[PDB]
Amino acid sequence: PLQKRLESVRKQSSFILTPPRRKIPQCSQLQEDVDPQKVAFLLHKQWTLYSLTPLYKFSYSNLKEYSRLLNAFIVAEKNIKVIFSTLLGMKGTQRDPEAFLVQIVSKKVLWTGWFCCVFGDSLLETVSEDFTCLPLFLANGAESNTAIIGTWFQKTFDCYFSPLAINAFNLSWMAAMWTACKMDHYVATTEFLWSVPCSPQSLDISFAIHPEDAKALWDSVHKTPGEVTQEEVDLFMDCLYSHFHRHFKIHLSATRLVRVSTSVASAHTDGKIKILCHKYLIGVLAYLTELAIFQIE
Amino acid sequence: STKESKNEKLKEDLEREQRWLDEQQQIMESLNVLHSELKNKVKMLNIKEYKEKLLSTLGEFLEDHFPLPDVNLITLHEMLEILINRLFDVPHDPYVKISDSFWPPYVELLLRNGIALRHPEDPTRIRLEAFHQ
Amino acid sequence: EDALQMAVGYFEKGPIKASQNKDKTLEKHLKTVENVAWKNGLASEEIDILLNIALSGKFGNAVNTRILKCMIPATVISEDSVVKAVSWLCVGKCSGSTKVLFYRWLVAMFDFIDRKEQINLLYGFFFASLQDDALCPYVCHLLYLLTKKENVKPFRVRKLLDLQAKMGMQPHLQALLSLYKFFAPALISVKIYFKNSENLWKTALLAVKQRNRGPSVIPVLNSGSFPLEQLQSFPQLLQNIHCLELPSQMGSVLNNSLLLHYINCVRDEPVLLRFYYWLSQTLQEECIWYKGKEFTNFLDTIIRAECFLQEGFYSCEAFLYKSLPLWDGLCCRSQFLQLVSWIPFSSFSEVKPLLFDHLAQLFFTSTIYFKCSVLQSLKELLQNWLLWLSSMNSVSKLIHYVGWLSTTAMRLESNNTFLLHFILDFYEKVCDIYINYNLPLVVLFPPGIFYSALLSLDTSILNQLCFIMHRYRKNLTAASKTYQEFNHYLTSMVGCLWHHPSFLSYAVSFLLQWSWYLDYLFSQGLQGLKLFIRSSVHHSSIP
Amino acid sequence: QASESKLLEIQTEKNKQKQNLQMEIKITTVIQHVFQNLILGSKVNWAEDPALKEIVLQLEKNVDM
């Protein structure tokens, strides 16, 4: 059945094909079904990433039942309440299932969980009808609450959250991706963070570039319009490294990139995401949505 | 030494194989007999026999354990019959008025044991608990 | 009599006259009972007597309490005793603390009652005790274990909802209500801890019997379909195989062979994906956390389950594909090499680029014992593939590849016979394709191994070569260039045989102890040699 | 293989079969509950009475079966 062709497709999945070019996201206003207040609460906040196997027998109707079940589990673990909400307009395609939010309110929200999937169809192409595919989870709150919610979900839907990790290659690619994005209001200078590998804690280089200089350098190293290519990313990194070495005769290339921040969003290797501008928000998710699939497959 | 080790390993694996074979055997006879029983198998009269048996035994139990002392009182059987009849004849008003023929101990007995329920405002009326819903 | 039967009779006689020395007598009898109960347990009959004596109005509250606290079975508990106990509870002349203790005992001794159907018939009497708020938690804990799908009636759901509204969302009420929702979701919209559930009767022998009653890496199992918790015996599975329900998590299926029996034939698509993602992510998290004994034990359990079902898993296959290039060869070598044995049949054109390349990478550079190890793994794979099939180009290419590895390593190790033994054993396992699986395909071992082994210096090598050519001849006569090479080899060994240096040992013994000396060799234990020289060469059929 | 085929066929066939009577079912349920509540209220040791014992076990039967 689905298992056989799924075996074949992950057999074909080898590190031999060239990395495909990616289309630069364009300035896109928030969708009509998207509530500005809900995303405004979501944006300008820190989120922890989690990859998820597809939900088993998940229904969007019995949300109150889920809320009361989580409340019962929490009180069993022990003036708080659990609220389930349905959020429209942030699905990449019609194939991607509807997204929803879970909140913990102390009768002041303390813990928020977001389940979503944008442009994620390969998982949806290899799944049966019973399952719901929202492999992207964003957590914001206390770690104990996150662990409790994860335990409940493991017991209920037969799934786990895996802490999604981002390497230097992916982080550099996404850095180039958002520095390709056009921002009308440069409200945050781009900034990169590094960490020298050493058992005792050592120097952590932070390198910041003025947004105008960064955009000019990007357009200088921008060849294919509306698209980003591996050669563009490599030359971007090479130019930064050459500038750093010309300044200080220090090979930054022998250091691990750990955090990249720009005007629109910021990412960290451990799985920290900060979002500022809505105009590219959706596209952001799509990119990181691929990483969940790449962790599932 | 490898030769011995594999000899006892194969002996253990063979014993496990006979264990699994034996277990799946009775698994097979159980599955086959269940399939045959379902094939051979494939209501009103059964329910009627049960209802009549239950009613006769209930009447005997009532006469043996809830007798009248000696106005004209009715038996607890007739009271239960009136309640059951009104419960299904008038599903929108199953209350029956309490007359002098209702022995007050019987009414209180039906009230204590959750069988009869009092009207929220009219004390002279009681209904039967709808156990079917 | 016997020491205990005297006490049982004394308690059957009921309370006696005014106490002159009767307190001491009652104490002696009660002490004898509890001593027997706490040493090895009580029989069903004695329990049937004493439980109903305690739940009756006879004797005071202390005597009944001690009797209840010493109602520990040595084997099982009769359900008729429990029925009579429920009747005694219905009588009403029982103490409230005694009722609480009896419900606690019924919950604690639930898995020691021989049958529970007649007890489930008393579900109405059990449910009507929810009105009492002193028995409510214990009655809820009992109903949580006793409830089947047939017991979830609309009236009971309504009354339980009203009781929840009266008392609030109590933990026991919420557990019972969640069970009712699981059994009947349509009536609601229109492994759980209970307080005071400490096992007061937990002796050591009762503990060993409770652990014998069970025939986190593994998730804790959470439940007219048969409830999964009630599945505790093989006859129960035999009776209820048709009406089984899939668990919320099937990890407990691994260490519970009862559900494995239904898994073997369920052939359900969704559970396949559910177990695939489960085991794959479990393998990923265990591997990342390792960098060990618990991981080894978990993989051993996986291998044991893999021995059953007579077919390989795919999560393990994907994990091994991902980790083989990164594999050092010594992290969990014992665990890895047993998974390659159970690999699904596939054409020998996609596995080699992804799987066998790193296998050869390790093989050409790792220890000779590791070479014998991977040889055993591949011969087990060949056995499994032939068993499953019972196409031919794939196995032919696999045999050619393993033979190339064989000859290369045979050169590599300065012609060490330790690997030669595994080579020859593998080839014996190969040599029976036509007669074991009805497959008209015979592959011939390379001449390098032929000449290295045939004229080798070890006698057991000569033995197993005689055996292997005898089997090859038997297979050939059972059903072009293959026959020519076989005849050339036969001429080669008949020229080499009737001397051989490997037999000089025997000759020295022949000097220590007769024109015909082959009989002494035969008595030394060369029975394969008789088989080869009597039924294969046919040049001198007579001994 | 034989067991897989047998389970497949039995499952397929099992899915394949898948004013008086209804009101009589309701009345029989009501009578069951009334009898049980009366037996409970009488406080009778029903296990001592053989007929009462074998009838108490007749209760808790789904009439719609």
Curated annotation (Swiss-Prot), chain A:
The keyword Nucleus applies. The modification Phosphothreonine is found at T18. It is found in: Nucleus; Chromosome, Centromere. Transmembrane segments: none annotated. It comes from the Eukaryota. The modification Phosphoserine is found at S14, S28. GO terms for cellular component: cytosol; inner kinetochore; nucleoplasm; nucleus. Keywords: Centromere, Chromosome, Nucleus, Phosphoprotein. It holds the Pfam family CENP-L. Its main location: nucleus. GO terms for biological process: chromosome segregation. The keyword Coiled coil does not apply. Belongs to the CENP-L/IML3 family. Component of the CENPA-CAD complex, composed of CENPI, CENPK, CENPL, CENPO, CENPP, CENPQ, CENPR and CENPS. The CENPA-CAD complex interacts with the CENPA-NAC complex, at least composed of CENPA, CENPC, CENPH, CENPM, CENPN, CENPT and CENPU. Component of the CENPA-CAD (nucleosome distal) complex, a complex recruited to centromeres which is involved in assembly of kinetochore proteins, mitotic progression and chromosome segregation. May be involved in incorporation of newly synthesized CENPA into centromeres via its interaction with the CENPA-NAC complex. This is Centromere protein L. The gene is CENPL.
Curated annotation (Swiss-Prot), chain B:
It is found in: Nucleus; Chromosome, Centromere; Chromosome, Centromere, Kinetochore. Residues 1-42 form a coiled coil. It comes from the Eukaryota. Detected in several fetal organs with highest levels in fetal liver. In adults, it is weakly expressed in lung and placenta. It is linked to Chromosomal aberrations involving CENPK are a cause of acute leukemias. Translocation t(5;11)(q12;q23) with KMT2A/MLL1. Component of the CENPA-CAD (nucleosome distal) complex, a complex recruited to centromeres which is involved in assembly of kinetochore proteins, mitotic progression and chromosome segregation. May be involved in incorporation of newly synthesized CENPA into centromeres via its interaction with the CENPA-NAC complex. Acts in coordination with KNL1 to recruit the NDC80 complex to the outer kinetochore. Belongs to the CENP-K/MCM22 family. Component of the CENPA-CAD complex, composed of CENPI, CENPK, CENPL, CENPO, CENPP, CENPQ, CENPR and CENPS. The CENPA-CAD complex interacts with the CENPA-NAC complex, at least composed of CENPA, CENPC, CENPH, CENPM, CENPN, CENPT and CENPU. Interacts directly with CENPH. This is Centromere protein K. The lineage of its organism: Eukaryota, Metazoa, Chordata, Craniata, Vertebrata. The gene is CENPK. The chain holds residues 109 to 269 of 269 of the full protein.
Swiss-Prot record, chain C:
One of its GO terms (cellular component) is nucleus. Keywords: Centromere, Chromosome, Nucleus, Ubl conjugation. Induction: By follicle-stimulating hormone (FSH). Sumoylated. Sumoylated form can be polyubiquitinated by RNF4, leading to its degradation. Desumoylation by SENP6 prevents its degradation. GO terms for biological process: CENP-A containing chromatin assembly; chromosome segregation; mitotic sister chromatid segregation; sex differentiation. Its main location: nucleus. It is found in: Nucleus; Chromosome, Centromere. Component of the CENPA-CAD complex, composed of CENPI, CENPK, CENPL, CENPO, CENPP, CENPQ, CENPR and CENPS. The CENPA-CAD complex interacts with the CENPA-NAC complex, at least composed of CENPA, CENPC, CENPH, CENPM, CENPN, CENPT and CENPU. Interacts with SENP6. Belongs to the CENP-I/CTF3 family. Component of the CENPA-CAD (nucleosome distal) complex, a complex recruited to centromeres which is involved in assembly of kinetochore proteins, mitotic progression and chromosome segregation. May be involved in incorporation of newly synthesized CENPA into centromeres via its interaction with the CENPA-NAC complex. Required for the localization of CENPF, MAD1L1 and MAD2 (MAD2L1 or MAD2L2) to kinetochores. Involved in the response of gonadal tissues to follicle-stimulating hormone. This is Centromere protein I. It comes from Homo sapiens (Human). The gene is CENPI.
Curated annotation (Swiss-Prot), chain D:
Transmembrane segments: none annotated. It is found in: Nucleus; Chromosome, Centromere, Kinetochore. Disulfide bonds: none annotated. It comes from the Eukaryota. Component of the CENPA-NAC (nucleosome-associated) complex, a complex that plays a central role in assembly of kinetochore proteins, mitotic progression and chromosome segregation. The CENPA-NAC complex recruits the CENPA-CAD (nucleosome distal) complex and may be involved in incorporation of newly synthesized CENPA into centromeres. Required for chromosome congression and efficiently align the chromosomes on a metaphase plate. Self-associates. Component of the CENPA-NAC complex, at least composed of CENPA, CENPC, CENPH, CENPM, CENPN, CENPT and CENPU. The CENPA-NAC complex interacts with the CENPA-CAD complex, composed of CENPI, CENPK, CENPL, CENPO, CENPP, CENPQ, CENPR and CENPS. Interacts directly with CENPK. Interacts with KIF2C and NDC80. Interacts with TRIM36. Belongs to the CENP-H/MCM16 family. This is Centromere protein H. It comes from Homo sapiens (Human). The lineage of its organism: Eukaryota, Metazoa, Chordata, Craniata, Vertebrata. The chain holds residues 166 to 246 of 247 of the full protein.
